[PDB]
């Protein structure tokens, strides 16, 4: 499956799979088997299915049995909510929801607008401006730094560490995790003494069962960094890619820019910046679309395929149409693990798109759509470059 044609445009393959092979077993780059689930109905149900596990210990045990080696238990910093099942997940999630509120995101928007305006100042000076390099790549970790409460004095080191929290180019996951942990532990202690208007402070001073331990707050911060950096980059890039490859619709959006909050969901659905969700492990035998998948197997659920499924969106699902009724989509997941950062991701996309279209009303792609490229993806997916003419 994982061919170059799939990498660049998976939608024809997803159409074949949804029709002919809605559960298809593949081998992943690590040598383990995975089962790719492509129909919207099955992706949604699987995300709601208590028989599927996100527990990292269970997943590594299954991976180790398939590859024949026992994998060592992972560090407790990895036991955050995205790597947990209930009841552990329920407690960690409840504390995070208490602090990471829609109101907190709304309150971050003034500074986010100011950050975007500064990034566009730098973009306006480039000889060959690129919306990925100049906007979609830098914005997410700036937003996460603001959300957490990282001081500007520590900015450059935080950015360096965050480039590992996705081992990425260096493989320094252990070293950077240790260093970032020591830094974030000191920041958590600083917010205990000197609380400020940020998420770490809100979690440190939470009451009752909403209060996690300092180590759990540290692990939560790691989940937010890994969960919201490359994903948001892909979402912002994908939304711009959708507009820029459909200039007639970009023109209409520019002419009626107040519609933007009611159009972003279609940009997200169409661009589908989440190719797969996090892996799921079967805790017991499960039947999906006529196929029995035994206990102990790994599922790969595709929001991108679900978002383009005509069973869920009968009218031209493989086309972008900003005028269609606001669609529901699976890009943020579904069920108990539904993206905690969805309002913050939306805000970054809305602010970025609005300010680009306002400041650069003639913005257009500098290449033909056929020249865009993607790299192989196991989670988030978007073009590797978005060169524009301003
Ligand atoms: C600053 C922005 C973001 C932050 C802080 C963030 C953080 C998180 C966290 C902590 C979780 C785990 C929730 C849980 O397990 O209960 C999560 C789930 C998820 N996030 Fe986000 N996220 C952000 C943006 C995004 C974006 C832009 C996308 C899509 C392109 C995305 C897609 C998802 C999905 C699909 C899930 C569910 C995963 C699954 O069920 O397998 N997130 N997010
Ligand atoms: C494998 C652990 C991932 C930590 C948070 C990721 C959330 C997401 O799927 O974007």
Cα distance between residue 3 and residue 300, in whole Å = 17
CA neighbor of 285 nearest in space, from 299, 297, 271, 268: 297
Torsion of CA 221, 225, 227, 230, to 10 degrees: 180
Q: What is the DSSP string of 114-142?
A: HHHHHHHHHHHT-SS-BHIIIIITTHHHH
Q: What interhelical angle do 214-228 and 139-148 show, nearest 10?
A: 160
Using the mean position of ligand 1's atoms as its centre, give its distance from the Cα of residue 255 in Å: 32
Q: Phi and psi dihedrals of 275, rounded to 5?
A: -75, -45
DSSP track, 274-292? BSS-S-EEESS-EEETTEE
Q: Does the annotation flag 337 for ligand binding? A: yes
Pocket perturbation via mutation, ligand 2, pick of 226, 274, 339, 378 by most ligand atoms within 8 A of CB: 226
Q: Tell me if 93 CB under 6 Å of ligand 1.
A: yes
Between CA 350 and CA 108 the distance in angstroms is 13
Q: Is 148 labelled as part of a ligand binding site? A: no
Ligand 1 lined by 306 (C-beta under 6 Å): no
Which residue, 251, 208, 280, 229, is CA-closest to 382?
Answer: 229
Q: What's 347-364 look like in SS3?
A: HHHHHHHHHHHHHCCCCE
Stated resolution in angstroms: 1.4
Handedness of CA 303, 304, 310, 314 (dihedral sign): positive
- Can you tell me the distance from the alpha carbon of 215 to that of 207, in angstroms, rounded to the nearest whole number? 16
Within the chain, where are the H helices?
A: 4-8, 11-20, 40-47, 56-67, 88-99, 102-124, 131, 139-148, 155-162, 173-193, 199-204, 214-228, 230-244, 247-255, 260-271, 303-307, 342-359
93 is in an annotated binding site: yes
Question: Closest Cα partner for 115 from 11, 236, 227?
Answer: 236
72-79 contact pairs (CB < 8 A, 24+):
75/177, 76/215, 76/219, 77/177, 77/181, 77/215, 77/218, 77/219, 77/222, 78/219, 79/219
Q: Ligand 1: which atom is nearest the Cα of residue 268?
A: 30
Q: How was this structure determined?
A: X-ray
Does residue 307 sit in helix, strand or coil?
helix
Superfamily of domain 4-389: Cytochrome P450 (1.10.630.10)
- Measured by CA distance, the residue closest to atom 34 of ligand 1 is 332
**What is the residue whose two structure tokens read 């290449």?**
367
Q: Parallel, antiparallel, or unpaired: how do β-strands 298-301 and 291-293 relate? A: unpaired
79 appears as a binding residue in the annotation? no
Note whether 187 and 161 are within 8 A (CB): no
Pocket test of ligand 1: the residue of 341, 349, 350, 380 to mutate, having most ligand atoms within 8 Å of its CB, is 341
Sign of CA dihedral 164, 158, 146, 354: negative
37 strand-pairing partners: 23, 301
Q: Cα dist. 287→19, 23, 41, 52, 309 in Å?
A: 17, 10, 13, 12, 20
349-365 burial: b if 16+ Cβ within 10 Å, else e = bbbbbbbbbeebeebeb
* Ligand 1 contact via 224 beta carbon (within 6 Å): yes
What does the angle CA 20 – CA 24 – CA 25 come to, to the nearest 5 degrees?
A: 155
Half-sphere exposure of 4 (CA within 13 A, CB side): 1
Q: Are 319 and 205 in contact, with CB atoms under 8 Å apart?
A: no
- Is 104 annotated in some ligand binding site? no
Contact 337 CB / ligand 1 (< 6 Å): yes
**CA–centroid distance, residue 370 to ligand 2 (Å):** 31
User: Is the separation of the CB atoms in 11 and 318 below 8 Å?
Assistant: yes
Around ligand 2, the residues with Cβ closer than 6 Å are 82-83, 223, 226-227, 231, 278
329 among annotated binding-site residues: no
Question: Which residues pair with residue 300 across a beta bridge?
Answer: 36
Check the chain for breaks (C–N over 2.5 Å) and list the residue before each, or none: 166
């Amino acid at each position: 499956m994982f061919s170059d044609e799939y990498t660049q445009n998976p939608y024809p393959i997803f159409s074949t799979l949804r029709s002919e092979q809605p559960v298809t077993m593949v081998q992943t780059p690590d040598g383990a088997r995975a089962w790719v689930i492509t129909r919207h109905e099955d992706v949604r149900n699987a995300l709601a299915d208590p028989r599927l596990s996100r527990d990292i210990g269970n997943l590594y045990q299954a991976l180790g049995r398939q590859i024949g080696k026992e994998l060592k238990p992972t560090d407790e910093i990895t036991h955050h909510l995205a790597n947990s099942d209930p009841p552990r997940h329920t407690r960690l999630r409840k504390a995070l929801v208490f602090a990471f509120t829609p109101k907190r995101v709304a309150n971050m928007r003034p500074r986010l607008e100011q950050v975007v305006e500064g990034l566009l100042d730098e973009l306006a000076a480039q000889h060959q401006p690129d919306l990925l390099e100049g906007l979609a790549e830098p914005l997410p970790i700036i937003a996460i730094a603001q959300l957490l409460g990282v001081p500007d004095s520590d900015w450059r080191q935080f950015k360096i560490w965050s480039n590992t929290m996705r081992a990425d180019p260096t493989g320094l996951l252990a070293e950077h995790t240790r260093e970032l942990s020591a830094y974030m532990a000191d920041l958590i202690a600083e917010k205990e003494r000197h609380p400020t208007d940020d998420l770490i402070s809100a979690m440190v001073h939470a009451e009752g069962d909403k209060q996690l331990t300092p180590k759990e707050i540290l692990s939560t911060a790691f989940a937010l960094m890994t969960g919201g950096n490359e994903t948001t980059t892909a979402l912002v890039t994908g939304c711009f890619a959708a507009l820029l490859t459909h200039p007639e619709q970009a023109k209409r959006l520019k002419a009626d820019l107040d519609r933007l909050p009611q159009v972003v969901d279609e940009l997200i659905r169409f661009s589908s910046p989440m190719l797969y969700t996090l892996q799921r492990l079967t805790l017991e035998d499960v039947e999906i679309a006529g196929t029995t998948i035994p206990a102990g197997e790994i599922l790969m659920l595709s929001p991108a395929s679900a978002n383009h499924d005509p069973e869920a969106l009968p009218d031209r699902p493989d086309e972008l149409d900003i005028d269609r009724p606001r669609p529901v989509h699976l890009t943020f997941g579904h069920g108990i693990h539904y993206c905690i950062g969805s309002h913050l991701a939306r805000a970054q996309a809305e602010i970025s798109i609005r300010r680009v279209l306002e400041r650069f009303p003639d913005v257009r792609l500098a290449v033909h759509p056929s020249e865009l490229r993607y790299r192989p993806a196991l989670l988030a997916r978007a073009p590797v470059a978005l060169p524009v003419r301003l």
